[PDB]
Amino acid sequence: GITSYVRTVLCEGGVPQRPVVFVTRKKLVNAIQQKLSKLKGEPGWVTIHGMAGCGKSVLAAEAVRDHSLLEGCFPGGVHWVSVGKQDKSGLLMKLQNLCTRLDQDESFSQRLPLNIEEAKDRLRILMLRKHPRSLLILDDVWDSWVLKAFDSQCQILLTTRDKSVTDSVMGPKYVVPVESSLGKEKGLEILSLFVNMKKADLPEQAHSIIK
Amino acid sequence: ECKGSPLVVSLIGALLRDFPNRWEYYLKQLQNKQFKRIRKSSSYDYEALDEAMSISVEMLREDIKDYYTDLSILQKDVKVPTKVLCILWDMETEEVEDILQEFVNKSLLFCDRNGKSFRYYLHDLQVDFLTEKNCSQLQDLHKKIITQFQRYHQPHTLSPDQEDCMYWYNFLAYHMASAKMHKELCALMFSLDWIKAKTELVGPAHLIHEFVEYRHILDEKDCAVSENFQEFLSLNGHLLGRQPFPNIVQLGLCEPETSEVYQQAKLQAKQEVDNGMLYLEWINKKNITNLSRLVVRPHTDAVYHACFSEDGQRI
Ligand SMILES: Nc1ncnc2c1ncn2[C@H]1C[C@H](O)[C@@H](COP(=O)(O)OP(=O)(O)OP(=O)(O)O)O1
Numbered sequence: 001g002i003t004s005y006v007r008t009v010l011c012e013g014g015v016p017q018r019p020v021v022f023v024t025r026k027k028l029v030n031a032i033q034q035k036l037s038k039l040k041g042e043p044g045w046v047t048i049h050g051m052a053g054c055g056k057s058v059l060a061a062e063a064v065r066d067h068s069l070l071e072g073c074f075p076g077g078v079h080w081v082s083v084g085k086q087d088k089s090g091l092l093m094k095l096q097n098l099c100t101r102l103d104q105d106e107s108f109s110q111r112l113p114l115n116i117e118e119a120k121d122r123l124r125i126l127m128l129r130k131h132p133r134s135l136l137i138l139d140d141v142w143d144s145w146v147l148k149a150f151d152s153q154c155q156i157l158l159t160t161r162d163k164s165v166t167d168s169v170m171g172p173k174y175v176v177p178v179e180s181s182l183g184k185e186k187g188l189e190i191l192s193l194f195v196n197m198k199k200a201d202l203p204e205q206a207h208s209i210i211k
Numbered sequence: 212e213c214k215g216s217p218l219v220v221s222l223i224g225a226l227l228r229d230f231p232n233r234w235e236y237y238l239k240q241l242q243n244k245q246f247k248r249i250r251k252s253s254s255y256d257y258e259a260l261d262e263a264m265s266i267s268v269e270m271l272r273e274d275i276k277d278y279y280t281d282l283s284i285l286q287k288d289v290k291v292p293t294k295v296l297c298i299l300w301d302m303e304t305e306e307v308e309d310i311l312q313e314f315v316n317k318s319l320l321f322c323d324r325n326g327k328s329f330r331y332y333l334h335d336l337q338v339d340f341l342t343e344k345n346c347s348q349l350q351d352l353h354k355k356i357i358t359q360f361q362r363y364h365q366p367h368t369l370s371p372d373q374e375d376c377m378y379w380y381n382f383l384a385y386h387m388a389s390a391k392m393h394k395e396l397c398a399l400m401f402s403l404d405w406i407k408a409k410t411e412l413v414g415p416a417h418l419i420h421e422f423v424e425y426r427h428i429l430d431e432k433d434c435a436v437s438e439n440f441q442e443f444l445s446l447n448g449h450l451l452g453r454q455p456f457p458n459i460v461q462l463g464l465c466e467p468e469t470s471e472v473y474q475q476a477k478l479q480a481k482q483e484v485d486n487g488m489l490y491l492e493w494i495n496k497k498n499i500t501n502l503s504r505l506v507v508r509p510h511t512d513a514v515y516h517a518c519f520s521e522d523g524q525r526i
Pocket residue numbers: 019021022023024051052053054055056057058059140160161
């Protein structure tokens with residue numbers, strides 16, 4: 001049960017809304033969230049990983065989707081960044097864009113840094129004062145210097161495919177590892193939603209394809 | 212092996228986080244002495260410990276840079292008297308110290324302010340890096356130092372007062388081995404008088420230790436000569452050190468067979484004899500003495516007890 005307020009914080013954050021055809025993974029979401037709860041304060045990084053298309057992002061979106069962990073724990077808003085895969089130049093822009101996003105007031109200089117580190121300063125400072133209890137989520141990430149760039153000393157959680165990526169970084173690191181499996185009961189649940197029929201009404205063919 | 216470079220410990224330690232089972236492997240790996248095997252991504256800015264040292268070496272001005280390599284030859288744990296560095300360099304002493312002072316600042320060579328004398332030396336890690344990065348040269352240079360010493364003091368021309376000489380006893384023997392020059396090695400270690408002076412201030416243990424190293428270096432046939440000499444030493448330990456270093460040349464003519472040690476003695480005796488010295492020949496050796504393998508006098512004062520190490524390595 002999403003609170004109306006949760007959506008309001010989430011909209012500001014910019015996390016994608018969950019696909020209309022989804023199926024909770026209560027145990028997994030619960031684990032990330034309880035673990036996610038763990039770094040109550042002081043920096044910290046969380047890595048989530050799986051072979052391609054394991055529900056890795058949706059869980060990240062889903063975990064924060066809940067009110068309890070987020071509201072009591074996280075007075076700071078949540079900011080989502082879609083890192084992707086980047087050459088050094090490309091990475092630079094994302095940083096400026098995060099700069100513009102975070103500084104809604106514009107009190108900070110309209111001029112944007114031409115240097116990565118300066119952006120790192122704007123992030124750290126902004127996280128430190130402007131958004132004291134903020135959590136940053138990342139999407140993908142394929143090389144370490146990238147997290148080197150985002151290494152603001154403020155909690156950022158990166159979700160990915162390589163688990164090697166967060167080795168440059170410093171501070172407590174925890175990993176929740178998503179095996180690509182799912183549940184036969186659940187997929188039937190998912191298939192039903194996809195074709196809109198009582199699960200039993202589903203044809204004999206359906207059972208086998210899920211295998 | 213770590214020698215306290217916390218970078219090595221974290222480097223080994225993290226390395227183990229992944230593979231708890233391969234515990235011995237890295238042990239033997241560091242026993243290997245190569246650091247190319249150990250690598251971890253880390254907060255620290257380098258894949259490995261070898262990685263750090265390379266960064267330090269580059270900065271030195273080209274004129275200085277060549278010199279460090281010469282510095283490579285020096286033992287892991289020897290505080291060498293400045294002079295020997297002067298000799299290899301062939302550069303005057305007031306000057307030589309200062310370049311080394313610049314190194315010490317580069318933190319690539321630790322200082323030793325013992326009295327007027329200065330002994331510089333390295334960390335085990337620093338030494339290991341050198342062989343790792345300078346090994347091909349080292350065999351070649353090993354022959355450079357010796358020739359320079361030849362341009363100065365001869366081993367017989369060596370003296371007790373000179374500061375450098377003990378390094379020269381203790382380790383000159385060492386350099387020739389790397390040199391791989393066995394005939395020169397014969398020119399030095401064999402010399403009985405060199406043994407005399409060495410046993411005069413060194414004692415009769417270092418030579419034995421050198422000999423074991425010596426055996427691989429030269430020839431199997433000589434090895435017998437070394438076997439004959441070791442046999443000549445067996446009689447040395449018990450009374451040789453005292454003081455009245457009894458004219459060995461006279462006490463030497465006691466060995467059996469002949470070998471190379473006995474051959475030397477008879478000729479020496481013949482040389483002595485015409486001049487005088489009233490040496491008395493001995494005619495019964497083959498008929499007498501069941502020789503013990505070794506004798507030790509640890510104390511001028513009567514022994515009361517002795518015990519083997521449980522390992523058996525020492526007593
Ligand atoms: N309830 C659900 N949980 C997880 N995935 C779902 C669900 N319902 C549908 N899906 C499908 C549709 C989406 O395309 C996909 C979710 O994408 P996601 O798990 O974020 O992949 P990903 O982002 O880890 O891939 P990549 O590793 O390429 O980034 O799974």
